[PDB]
Amino acid sequence: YVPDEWEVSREKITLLRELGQGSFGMVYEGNARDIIKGEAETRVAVKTVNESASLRERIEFLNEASVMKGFTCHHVVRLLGVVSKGQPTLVVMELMAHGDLKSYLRSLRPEAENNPGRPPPTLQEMIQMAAEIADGMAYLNAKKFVHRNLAARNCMVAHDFTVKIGDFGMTRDIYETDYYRKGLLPVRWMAPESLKDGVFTTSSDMWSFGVVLWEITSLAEQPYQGLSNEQVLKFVMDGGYLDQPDNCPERVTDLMRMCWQFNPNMRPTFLEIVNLLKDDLHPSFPEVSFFHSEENK
Numbered sequence: 597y598v599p600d601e602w603e604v605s606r607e608k609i610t611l612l613r614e615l616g617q618g619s620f621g622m623v624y625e626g627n628a629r630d631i632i633k634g635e636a637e638t639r640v641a642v643k644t645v646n647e648s649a650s651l652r653e654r655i656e657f658l659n660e661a662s663v664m665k666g667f668t669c670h671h672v673v674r675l676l677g678v679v680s681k682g683q684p685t686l687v688v689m690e691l692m693a694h695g696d697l698k699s700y701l702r703s704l705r706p707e708a709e710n711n712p713g714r715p716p717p718t719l720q721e722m723i724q725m726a727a728e729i730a731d732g733m734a735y736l737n738a739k740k741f742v743h744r745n746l747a748a749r750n751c752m753v754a755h756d757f758t759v760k761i762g763d764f765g766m767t768r769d770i771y772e773t774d775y776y777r778k779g780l781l782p783v784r785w786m787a788p789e790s791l792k793d794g795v796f797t798t799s800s801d802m803w804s805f806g807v808v809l810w811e812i813t814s815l816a817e818q819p820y821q822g823l824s825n826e827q828v829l830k831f832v833m834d835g836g837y838l839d840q841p842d843n844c845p846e847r848v849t850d851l852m853r854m855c856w857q858f859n860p861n862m863r864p865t866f867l868e869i870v871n872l873l874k875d876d877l878h879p880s881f882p883e884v885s886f887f888h889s890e891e892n893k
């Protein structure tokens with residue numbers, strides 16, 4: 597790692613509270629002073645790497661930040677700055693003020709003690725979420741990333757309820773092996789060919805996308821609840837897939853069934869999902885999407 601214009605002074609960052617454990621260590625909510633032009637102060641998420649990490653891991657932490665330097669998508673959580681001089685090393689992100697998509701959906705259940713007094717997501721809101729997630733994933737696919745970790749908990753929710761992909765889903769290649777499958781990669785979100793032969797492609801991400809939609813419409817229940825990890829592996833490898841949540845919108849169901857095609861070739865691409873959903877989204881969508889951008893080539 598070598599510093600550049602992404603270097604941000606430590607003293608600019610004030611930390612406010614722990615948000616939770618990220619893949620590398622504790623993530624914090626904070627404030628950053630003069631980190632974006634036209635803004636005195638910016639609400640940030642600050643990633644850290646925890647004490648127990650090897651030097652190799654510490655370098656891997658910064659390399660992840662390095663990769664996000666080349667991402668400018670409204671529907672992927674963006675990097676704001678890096679504090680690399682001295683320890684602790686800090687990776688500064690746009691804050692996603694409504695948390696991960698899984699916890700956000702759980703807050704919307706009838707029986708949630710942390711319920712914001714708002715109704716569960718409308719069909720309209722759900723479709724918007726889908727196109728947003730799909731647009732972020734399309735960007736990553738164009739950048740040549742296979743995510744491998746698409747799940748509601750890995751997607752974030754902004755202040756204005758925009759949903760973004762938290763990261764490019766960076767995993768060491770070893771976690772793709774049969775030992776770890778049957779590990780950091782979640783078997784309840786995995787395509788049958790990934791489960792079978794460790795094939796991870798943009799098509800297997802589409803399968804995981806379908807599970808996200810299932811999480812959206814079940815308000816983040818656990819996929820295949822009542823089955824063990826061994827039972828899911830077989831069930832899914834034999835041609836099985838999730839039942840539709842009670843009174844799930846038919847439009848979302850049709851989207852999930854497209855994703856859960858056994859033959860990867862028969863599944864949609866992320867651009868195709870955005871295309872399928874594009875004609876009834878928020879008027880701001882074309883202005884911010886990768887789909888409608890000059891970069892979508």
Ligand SMILES: COc1cc(N2CCN(C(C)C)CC2)ccc1Nc1nc(Nc2cccc(F)c2C(N)=O)c2cc[nH]c2n1
Pocket residue numbers: 615616617618619623625641673689690691692693694695696699749750752762
């Ligand atoms: C207030 O903002 C948040 C609240 C919660 N709440 C979660 C629900 N909690 C309940 C269970 C107590 C309260 C905190 C969770 C996340 C955010 N915002 C946020 N988090 C990020 N990363 C993570 C935070 C915690 C755990 C994680 F695994 C991650 C991660 N996957 O990286 C980022 C990264 C960029 N921007 C981010 N913004």
